[PDB]
Symmetry: C3
């Protein structure tokens, strides 16, 4: 039940390192992913590592929404919801223009681009937030 | 004075794992937060993990600033300053338009949106940088 | 003695799988690599990759003579920095209200997804993050 300086080993218990720790190989942490059909044609692909850092990738295209409106689709599942509202910037493919969405702590998503009419505009980009 | 394969333990010393490490529970690293009234109505909420990765959340509303001007507010505290100038993109709420700011290693912030006249414009978004961006 | 101690600087081989919770009060240092890319059309990327997974890209340079959906006509991203899946990274034009994005593709090519840019260079800046895995 001792940890050695060689060999593959499994280690249980809470280990608190008070100093500097270096890893020269790979550090593997939990990863979870989620796809959200957020509404109005917007899709989010979320990847969460260490139950904290989330990178959101925008897909789809948005139409028929105004600033301040919540997207009319599926809310972000509980394990991806941030503790505070997170504003994620995205870009309209092939344009000079951008938008942001807010992912609210309840999982709802609020649109904060300009109003978009019936003509969809492709939405892309990566945004990052911390859950805690 | 020995680390075991069970139990809660505290481990002092620089420990270098030359191979692979996996953590199946939570990995807790240092976290520090700071709110900065940057100037010109712009507010930054910074969260720094592992004295390295920072996510900056923009709040407030900017007015009366020209491109390339330092913002006329509070400088970023030393622990949050990057080693190289970092450009963080933000978005004006309810608009098609965006800006960026440069967070300078000295703690200052430079505005790099368009010139903004006296009417404030709400500023939002998350941007991330490494303090230790270099190998 | 081949055991890890609760004191002292020590180097430790073997894959160590911590099935529980781990806390680091000092700094955790993971592998870091950097790359500068003249991506084409004046666009420059400075990339930092940590743990062979998280990448922050920093845009520099000034872009000209590029159309939407065209691949940029410069150096492709070196293999170690390529994402598994296409990653769209938003950038900002310095001193302007306008923005762009590029797609960093799995082969290291980069596709321009701003508006078309004619002969006059516009300065490009900003950070974007992605996971390789």
């Amino acid at each position: 039940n001792v940890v050695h300086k060689t060999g593959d080993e499994t280690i249980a218990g809470k280990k608190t390192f008070t100093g500097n720790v270096e890893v020269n190989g790979s550090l593997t942490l939990p990863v979870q992913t989620l796809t959200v059909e957020a509404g109005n044609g917007l899709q989010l692909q979320l990847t969460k590592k260490n139950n904290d850092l989330v990178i959101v990738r925008f897909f789809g295209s948005v139409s028929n929404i105004q600033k301040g409106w919540n997207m009319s689709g599926t809310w972000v599942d509980r394990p991806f919801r941030p503790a505070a509202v997170q504003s994620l910037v995205g870009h309209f493919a092939g344009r000079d223009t951008s938008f942001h969405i807010d992912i609210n702590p309840n999982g709802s998503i609020t649109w904060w681009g300009a109003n978009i009419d019936k003509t969809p505009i492709a939405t892309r980009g990566n945004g990052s937030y911390f859950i805690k």
